[PDB]
Assembly symmetry: C4
Homo-oligomer: 112 residues x 4
Amino acid sequence: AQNYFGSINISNANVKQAVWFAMKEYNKESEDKYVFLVDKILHAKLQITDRMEYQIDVQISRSNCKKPLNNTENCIPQKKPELEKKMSCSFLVGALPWNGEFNLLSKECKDV
Amino acid sequence: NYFGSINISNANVKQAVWFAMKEYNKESEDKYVFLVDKILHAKLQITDRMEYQIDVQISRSNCKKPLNNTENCIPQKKPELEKKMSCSFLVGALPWNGEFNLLSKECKDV
Amino acid sequence: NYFGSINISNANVKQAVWFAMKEYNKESEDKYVFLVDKILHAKLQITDRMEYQIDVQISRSNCKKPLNNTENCIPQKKPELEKKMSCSFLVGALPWNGEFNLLSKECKDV
Amino acid sequence: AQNYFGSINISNANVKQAVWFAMKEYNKESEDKYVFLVDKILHAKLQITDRMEYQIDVQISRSNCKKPLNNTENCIPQKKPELEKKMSCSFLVGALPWNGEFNLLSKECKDV
Ligand SMILES: [Cl-]
Ligand SMILES: [Cl-]
Ligand SMILES: [Cl-]
Ligand SMILES: [Cl-]
Ligand SMILES: [Cl-]
Ligand SMILES: [Cl-]
Ligand SMILES: [Cl-]
Ligand SMILES: [Cl-]
Ligand code: NA
Ligand code: NA
Ligand code: NA
Ligand code: NA
Ligand code: NA
Ligand code: NA
């Protein structure tokens, strides 16, 4: 049905910043002991209202990095089968990206 | 003229549309918010400022003004309130300084 | 050399052309403003500052200086005032810091 | 093995700023008499973690400009055979590019 969301390039620096922001907040809010990182950015859509709203679909996986990330470098996807975890997530990120203002409005993740 | 086509993908074109629609809705004598169906075309004229001439299709939403944020806005489904328009906006900017100004608006029913 | 071609679509090329043309017009003792017919080519060299060598076609407009708060500038239609040039500008910059300098200009008729 | 770095378009303005930053640091740290400049940016990968991490492959060459570019001569690749030198470099640049914050995390250059 009709809405005011339009597909947007995933190349866009603001989409990448929206994903950076969403994943920072996802990890802070999650009850998992491990950091999830981005396997792939799958799709992005933009709604223009009083703010910019990015609806972003990402594939994320459980890393071998324990929260909090701190200065840990080269986190890799879990290699232990019992800890391997892949999810498809949809994030709704509100922004005035020209003002560096981002807000995670909604999250939904499913196992894949 | 001195207008050249620019990509609608350009972050400053999207900010110019956001800015034009904020001013369109503030200035409108409507109960409802109009939102962007489609950005149709953009051209840029370079003078003492950047001027973006942007064509957009807008429609009346089911959201009453001022935009409340939490609500889900979609095009009107009620026949007497359905309204689609083709708009041309001229937005002046020094986008590197966060400065945008609506120079001109023109909307026609479609 | 260390100059590489870049897309004229790039936001920083458009800011570099804005800066070059503002300085070109400020330096010119013409009573009319010159605006860009087309941006032709654009190259970037990365040293201590970003350097953009941009090739543009410009023409004498029907607007006299200072540009008015309203804007209706088109190429001159009076034969004795018609003037088109191919220009090369070298713009040095830290575009993230709002720092631009017009290092060099070169213009040829038609 | 798996990691969280993904190839990105080298056209990206933040890749160009990352290379500007990396080359400034490369040249200040080098013991060469001459400035090295960029023949070509070859490839870029992005990891999104608590910061943006750019893994950038560049071809650099020894210029005819001696250090530190204070007389601002127009630099070209060396035309003297014994000074001609091309290298393939990998730079790892950590950044919050929306905040103008860049850090050179790693450099590695090889003759080609
Ligand atoms: Cl490392
Ligand atoms: Cl009404
Ligand atoms: Cl104005
Ligand atoms: Cl053009
Ligand atoms: Cl500065
Ligand atoms: Cl001239
Ligand atoms: Cl950093
Ligand atoms: Cl910072
Ligand atoms: Na922006
Ligand atoms: Na066109
Ligand atoms: Na203009
Ligand atoms: Na208009
Ligand atoms: Na390039
Ligand atoms: Na994190």
